[PDB]
From Swiss-Prot, chain B:
Belongs to the pantothenate synthetase family. This is Pantothenate synthetase. CDD domains: PanC. Keywords: Acetylation, ATP-binding, Cytoplasm, Ligase, Magnesium, Metal-binding, Nucleotide-binding, Pantothenate biosynthesis, Virulence. Beta-alanine binds at residue 69. It comes from Mycobacterium tuberculosis (strain ATCC 25618 / H37Rv). One of its GO terms (biological process) is beta-alanine metabolic process. The gene is panC. GO terms for cellular component: cytosol.
Amino acid sequence: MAIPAFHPGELNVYSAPGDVADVSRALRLTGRRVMLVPTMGALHEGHLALVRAAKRVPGSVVVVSIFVNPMQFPRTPDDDLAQLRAEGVEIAFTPTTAAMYPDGLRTTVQPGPLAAELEGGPRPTHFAGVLTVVLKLLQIVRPDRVFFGEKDYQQLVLIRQLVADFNLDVAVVGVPTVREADGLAMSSRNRYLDPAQRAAAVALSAALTAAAHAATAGAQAALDAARAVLDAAPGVAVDYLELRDIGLGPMPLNGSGRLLVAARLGTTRLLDNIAIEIG
Amino acid sequence: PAFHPGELNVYSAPGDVADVSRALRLTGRRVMLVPTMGALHEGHLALVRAAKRVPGSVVVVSIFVNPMQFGAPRTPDDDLAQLRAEGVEIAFTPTTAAMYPDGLRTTVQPGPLAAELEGGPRPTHFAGVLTVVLKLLQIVRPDRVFFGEKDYQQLVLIRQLVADFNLDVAVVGVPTVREADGLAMSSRNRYLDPAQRAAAVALSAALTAAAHAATAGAQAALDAARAVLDAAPGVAVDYLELRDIGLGPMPLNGSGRLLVAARLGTTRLLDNIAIEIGT
């Protein structure tokens, strides 16, 4: 029994939700485990790590969606697909805005209060757009696991709330941030940094790593070390530098947490975060 | 495991009914879901019977009411007795804590239709409904879900939910069951004193009169309904509207729906009927 419209071993591209849903359901029925990697295209090494994390799950078929979601606000379709082909990805889902929101923004997802904080201050409706599209992609593909990068930590935490709050039957996998050789978190925004800004941008990761090691001396020491590193960089306007628990609530007196930073270099906004252990 | 065929199996933990439902689906039995708030009457038994009619089906009837503190009183014992007597194999009766372990955090935001008609006096009512229904659909993963046509707006909003979030379930509307005189069955009817019960017949009489007046056009149909309601002692009408079957504007001719909501004392009653204009 062949699967309608699906060719094992090759990059199969689908634009209609119904097509990828049928293919995914037939594949699940034969016992394959469907992995979903949601992206907005313009792929770089960061995304490829997500793809590889998905691919290495035994008996898996990897679905990578490319969809620049209007609701949560780079375009090289062929470069993107070509890169996915090279990774051995078998399915690419590339729907049009029309096929995803045929009735505009009608029924949508309202995130909890965490969505109004940190990234949500500068962009109050951003996460509603992200959870709405992620929920839709989860229902279309019905994957066993969905992969997101830790770079957008708040996003990852909000997706975990989505999945828990709506009893979604999918495991959420956070993948460690892929970095450049000097530590700069990979991001499509890095290309907008001019030479001096690129050099100065190293301060974000350096400040966080300094903080994580300074942490044996406590929270004030960790924060102060990060700040000193940021104070030594020119042109890095810090929007926030916050210590929180892993779910982004208040940081406990001790234990595990996450240190997050967001800064603007010229008009380019950069983010980074790192696991922290107090004391 | 944990499921005895031919008997009423009662589960409180989401994980338990999800496992059982998953297992029953594997063996080919299609899962039917009938969501209710308890206080079952003949109207609900009609949903159950329509679900039972599906060839190889196992019927899941859930009983749950959102916690009042959300801003959007009985024992489950008689309802279960009823389900058992009706040959239902699964009852899902979760606690508020098990449905909302992290409280009301991520929720569903309905489209504009939720602010109209029933949504006027209760702005967040449908958000609560769609949120719970979405969760029940994810927990039970049924092939079909049944809702009564009595709550027509609700039914329409549930169909938007399923389409907008790409849910893979068929939504079945079941015709309203009525008392001998035409009164739509509802657990609220028991709150009508004798005079109110007698006056309450005006809702269905007004709708049926309109459906037949319709050969003379929509305005004539609305006028007939209004005249009947105006002749009814102590019936205070909240709204009486003729719309499209999707609840959009009613066209020149074609199918539609006439909806009415009224107050008799402090008991609010609803009813609606299919209308064929210029036919």
